[PDB]
Design a protein around this ligand. Structure first.
Ligand SMILES: CC(C)(COP(=O)(O)OP(=O)(O)OC[C@H]1O[C@@H](n2cnc3c(N)ncnc32)[C@H](O)[C@@H]1OP(=O)(O)O)[C@@H](O)C(=O)NCCC(=O)NCCS
Length: 272
């Protein structure tokens, strides 16, 4: 802690708080720690947002987690490296209507600065399927390239909206204030998302990771692989198959959950 972590993400690795080092960290982290909701899905809330609790889960126990766990963790880490970290909250609007009941603030992201930096950067290793896998400049109007899809920040409110080009369209991901939010608001937001019985993190399975050079997205028993925009689709045949995929492909420590019969029947109910 940090050698636990820098080793878990396989970064090796210079540690000075520079732009180069921020890009490489965000790259290794998103390549090694899957987005997943196995806990909420198993009726285990995500409540404790401390460095010790998140480190224990996403590093020592070799699990993934969601936005609060991912951006919680990588935030304690950059802080330690001597980056300056502000936590922000956001509402998710990915594939929202029209229809749109205003969404809850169920997302958290980071505004990061460092010595001699050219302005703030946005860090979000916890969105899931569409997470930006590079730090983005906290500036509006500029189209910003990554190893995968391009990103753009626009004014909305009061706040910003992050969009990404997917296929032949700009799609909105989440809206957010640049105001710092206290840890306690993050914890309230996490309680909601992990325990509210109509939460999609409670009622279905979702996983995401990046294995080169592509998004591997799991939603139920549907696995989508987006490489260079092209989507390949795999329908997993049974719950045993999905648990195996979570273990091999998504590199999650499934026994940590961790009676495989019990995970398999939740998956089967869910699912299935
Ligand atoms: C569950 C999740 C990982 C799965 O994403 P997914 O498997 O690609 O499916 P989605 O519902 O997100 O996307 C739907 C469509 O967009 C397409 N798409 C998504 N990403 C794409 C990309 N990288 N390139 C091309 N197409 C893409 C999908 O193929 C699908 O198209 P289709 O059904 O019309 O063929 C994702 O929706 C997710 O991470 N959820 C959001 C998390 C959240 O609420 N925020 C974090 C707070 S904790």
């Amino acid at each position: 802690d940090l050698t636990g972590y820098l080793d878990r993400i396989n970064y090796r690795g210079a540690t000075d708080p520079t732009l180069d080092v921020l890009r490489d960290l965000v790259s290794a982290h998103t390549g090694a720690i899957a987005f997943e909701n196995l806990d909420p899905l198993m009726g285990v809330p995500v409540d404790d947002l401390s460095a010790e609790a998140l480190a224990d889960k996403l590093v020592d126990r070799r699990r993934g987690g969601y936005c609060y766990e991912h951006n919680g963790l990588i935030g304690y880490v950059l802080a330690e490296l001597g980056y300056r970290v502000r936590r922000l909250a956001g509402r998710v609007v990915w594939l929202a209507p029209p229809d749109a009941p205003t969404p809850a603030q169920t997302h958290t992201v980071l505004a990061v600065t460092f010595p001699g930096c050219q302005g703030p950067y946005l860090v979000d290793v916890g969105f899931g399927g569409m997470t930006p896998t590079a730090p983005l400049r906290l500036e509006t109007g500029t189209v910003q390239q990554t190893a995968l899809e391009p990103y753009r920040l626009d004014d909305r409110g009061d706040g910003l909206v992050l969009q990404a080009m997917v296929r032949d369209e700009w799609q909105a991901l989440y809206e957010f204030s640049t105001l710092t939010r206290p840890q306690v608001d993050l914890r309230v937001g996490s309680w909601f998302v992990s325990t509210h019985p109509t939460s999609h993190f409670v009622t279905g399975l979702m996983a995401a990771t990046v294995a080169d050079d592509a998004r591997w997205n799991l939603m139920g028993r549907n696995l989508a692989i987006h490489r260079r925009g092209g989507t390949e689709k795999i329908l997993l045949e049974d719950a045993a198959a999905v648990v195996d995929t979570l273990g091999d492909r998504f590199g999650i420590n499934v026994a940590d959950v961790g009676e495989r019969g019990r995970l398999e029947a939740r998956i089967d109910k869910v699912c299935f």
